[PDB]
Ligand binder design. Structure first.
Ligand code: K
Ligand code: K
Ligand code: K
Ligand code: K
Ligand code: K
Ligand code: K
Ligand code: K
Ligand code: K
Ligand code: K
Ligand code: K
Ligand code: K
Ligand code: K
Ligand code: K
Ligand code: K
Ligand code: K
Ligand code: K
Ligand code: K
Ligand code: K
Ligand code: K
Ligand code: MG
Ligand code: MG
Ligand code: MG
Ligand code: MG
Ligand code: MG
Ligand code: MG
Ligand code: MG
Ligand code: MG
Ligand code: MG
Ligand code: MG
Ligand code: MG
Ligand code: MG
Ligand code: MG
Ligand code: MG
Ligand code: MG
Ligand code: MG
Ligand code: MG
Ligand code: MG
Ligand code: MG
Ligand code: MG
Ligand code: MG
Ligand code: MG
Ligand code: MG
Ligand code: MG
Ligand code: MG
Ligand code: MG
Ligand code: MG
Ligand code: MG
Ligand code: MG
Ligand code: MG
Ligand code: MG
Ligand code: MG
Ligand code: MG
Ligand code: MG
Ligand code: MG
Ligand code: MG
Ligand code: MG
Ligand code: MG
Ligand code: MG
Ligand code: MG
Lengths: 27, 46, 77
RNA sequence: UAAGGUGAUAUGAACCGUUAUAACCGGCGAUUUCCGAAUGGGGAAACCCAGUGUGUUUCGACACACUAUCAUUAACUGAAUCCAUAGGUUAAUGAGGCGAACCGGGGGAACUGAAACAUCUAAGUACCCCGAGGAAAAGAAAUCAACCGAGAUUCCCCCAG
RNA sequence: AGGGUGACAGCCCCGUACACAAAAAUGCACAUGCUGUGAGCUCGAUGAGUAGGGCGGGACACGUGGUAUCCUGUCUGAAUA
RNA sequence: UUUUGUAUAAUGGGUCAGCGACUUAUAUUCUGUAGCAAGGUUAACCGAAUAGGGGAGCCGAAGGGAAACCGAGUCUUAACUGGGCGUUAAGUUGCAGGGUAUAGACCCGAAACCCGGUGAUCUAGCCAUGGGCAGGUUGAAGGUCUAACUGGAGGACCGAACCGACUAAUGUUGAAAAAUUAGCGGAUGACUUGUGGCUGGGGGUGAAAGGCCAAUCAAACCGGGAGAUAGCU
RNA sequence: GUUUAUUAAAAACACAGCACUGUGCAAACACGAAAGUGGACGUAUACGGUGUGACGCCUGCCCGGUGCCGGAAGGUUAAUU
RNA sequence: AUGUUCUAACGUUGACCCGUAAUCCGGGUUGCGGACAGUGUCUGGUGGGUAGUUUGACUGGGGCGGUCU
């Protein structure tokens, strides 16, 4: 899953941590 | 000797009465069949 | 019921087939999971019962678009 | 429309009417108990018991209307929890139940045939379930054809056992 | 036509052919008012967890067969004139 | 009727009256008959039309070969002296009939299998809430190692009600689709009983007999698949 | 005590007692496509299953077969790739 | 590819708060587990627990024996 770091990953890393914690958003 | 029919009006009405028939879809189908046949007495109630 | 809230995937029927081609009825169930989705626009978690396929749909389309579809179908969340 | 009439078994009684409110026929209205989706709560159907509001009362009571549930929408209110959201309340709109077939969909046998039987058959039939309409469904080519062409869907006869 | 009448009726009776009729409600087909629906013309645009694939099933007259095509429970996954 | 064979003491029929079994549809073949004839005939449909239109088709006038293909021939084979099938028999459409096919397919008849319902008012187990057990015995623990006295245990004892059902006789088109009479077992308990409740059919329940689940049980009843199928009578 | 209501009441079933065995609790186990519910508002001195059947004296030898329990060197072996 | 650690998916039939008159359910807070468990699809094993069935004929009755070209 492509993400923009705000602070390619496994979909679960994005879905359940990075995006909810406000650390990234999808590309 | 004790025979099979031992009448109780309360048990009769609870087992087979109008409201017992109306309480389930299959009981309502009984009433629909008996209305379609043209029964004078739909249930044991009356 | 075993229904994906995103895709509407539900149990379908088919056959088990033996080596001797004996057919017995079976079901195929969706790969359903209850999952808490972060909805940034509401600052809230929304739990959906979703197929694994529905989770890929959410990843692609985004949770806001999917929940918009859910509201317009009368699908309560 | 009328010289007759008050449905039947079914006579009688007491009457109504004969130039037009006798009766009879048709249109539109009025009335329309109780049970039943039954909907104010309950219930062993045709019963038992309420709340609220008006109005009447001769103080004993009395009448009438409203009060189900769900969905949607709107307003107001409103947690854990800050904003909130869930929740709550009221109003409006709709639904609900029934019905022979036909129709679309979700499920789906077995006997039987195979001269046994398991693949296969019976058959996507019977049956159960959901939903609709006067019909339904389908439908305007990511279709066929064969280098020539056709031009959505549906139904009938062929092609062909 | 048909039915009735004390046996079998064109002319006894009720009808029948034919010719007419609506205060009221209502179907329909027109015409003409009114509310919303908004024609036409240049210029774009052209349906993605989709098509396709692997696994399991089902549907196609077609039983997996050398098996196209359709549907999809599961895992994937394009090009987009 | 069935049989090698029936007066047969094999089957069926008490009698009468009424009803009761080779059908229908569509395909296909053959026969008869009618029409037309190297042709015959139309289907749906159009038509107010039993008319008329409609020849899409179908059958026939050519076969041989697996086929390409060739064609009164063709196939076989490298090729036939040959050999196989063909060539010198009129068909076709109605109408009637015989047979066949698919359909319940001459009629009646299973035991069963499947699907959806109805049933625990009988009975089995359980749940809740009420009731019942005359009369008479025995004398545990305990109490005040043994004595007296006291005490009142028990799936304890004898025995009515009550619950059962061991034996015999009767009855067996019964008084009764399970009883009556004389005797018999339990009778404070793992007891018995009223009312109500719960468990549902490959399911229940069973101190277990395949017992019981409404006079039905090695898979209830009712309706449906259904005219199941029946090489049998 | 129980049993074949309606030809069997028994030596059959049950039984207290005994043993094996499972079960650490969201127990095993059972009814349920599931949610749940029983087990149990119990917790190994408990609960389920199995066999035996008061009590007394006892209960010998066999683990090759079939189960069950434990093991994991080696062989073989699925989808998948 | 195995192992440790982590928390954020997921589990909780621990505690507490709220909806709330509620021992269901949901939301919240927190503890404990934790990428395990569990579920879907696929797949090997096991599977009279359950189901559909098969289990020949001749024969001096049938069976047993014998036989079947
Ligand atoms: K079958
Ligand atoms: K057969
Ligand atoms: K006449
Ligand atoms: K796909
Ligand atoms: K004979
Ligand atoms: K005889
Ligand atoms: K014929
Ligand atoms: K002929
Ligand atoms: K020749
Ligand atoms: K002829
Ligand atoms: K026939
Ligand atoms: K049964
Ligand atoms: K006895
Ligand atoms: K052993
Ligand atoms: K937690
Ligand atoms: K896991
Ligand atoms: K088995
Ligand atoms: K012989
Ligand atoms: K003999
Ligand atoms: Mg009510
Ligand atoms: Mg009411
Ligand atoms: Mg409706
Ligand atoms: Mg057969
Ligand atoms: Mg339509
Ligand atoms: Mg072209
Ligand atoms: Mg006469
Ligand atoms: Mg397009
Ligand atoms: Mg395609
Ligand atoms: Mg695909
Ligand atoms: Mg393909
Ligand atoms: Mg495939
Ligand atoms: Mg297939
Ligand atoms: Mg003889
Ligand atoms: Mg003779
Ligand atoms: Mg003789
Ligand atoms: Mg004689
Ligand atoms: Mg005789
Ligand atoms: Mg005979
Ligand atoms: Mg006789
Ligand atoms: Mg030819
Ligand atoms: Mg005693
Ligand atoms: Mg008894
Ligand atoms: Mg006696
Ligand atoms: Mg005694
Ligand atoms: Mg006694
Ligand atoms: Mg036996
Ligand atoms: Mg019985
Ligand atoms: Mg059976
Ligand atoms: Mg049938
Ligand atoms: Mg029959
Ligand atoms: Mg005894
Ligand atoms: Mg007996
Ligand atoms: Mg006896
Ligand atoms: Mg529990
Ligand atoms: Mg024993
Ligand atoms: Mg078997
Ligand atoms: Mg069968
Ligand atoms: Mg058999
Ligand atoms: Mg034999």
């Amino acid at each position: 899953m492509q993400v923009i770091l705000l602070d390619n990953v496994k979909a679960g890393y994005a879905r359940n941590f990075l995006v909810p914690q406000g650390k990234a958003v999808p590309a | 000797m004790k025979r099979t029919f031992q009448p109780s009006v309360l048990k009769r009405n609870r087992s087979h009465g109008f409201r017992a028939r109306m309480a389930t879809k299959n009981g309502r189908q009984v009433l629909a069949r008996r209305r379609a046949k043209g029964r004078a007495r739909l249930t044991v109630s009356k | 019921s075993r229904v994906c809230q995103v895709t509407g995937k539900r149990p379908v029927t088919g056959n088990n087939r033996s080596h001797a081609l004996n057919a017995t009825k079976r079901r195929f169930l969706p790969n359903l999971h209850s999952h808490r989705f972060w909805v940034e626009s509401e600052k809230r978690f929304v739990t959906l019962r979703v197929s694994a396929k529905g989770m890929r749909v959410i990843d692609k389309k985004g949770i806001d678009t999917v929940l918009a579809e859910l509201r317009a179908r009368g699908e309560k969340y």
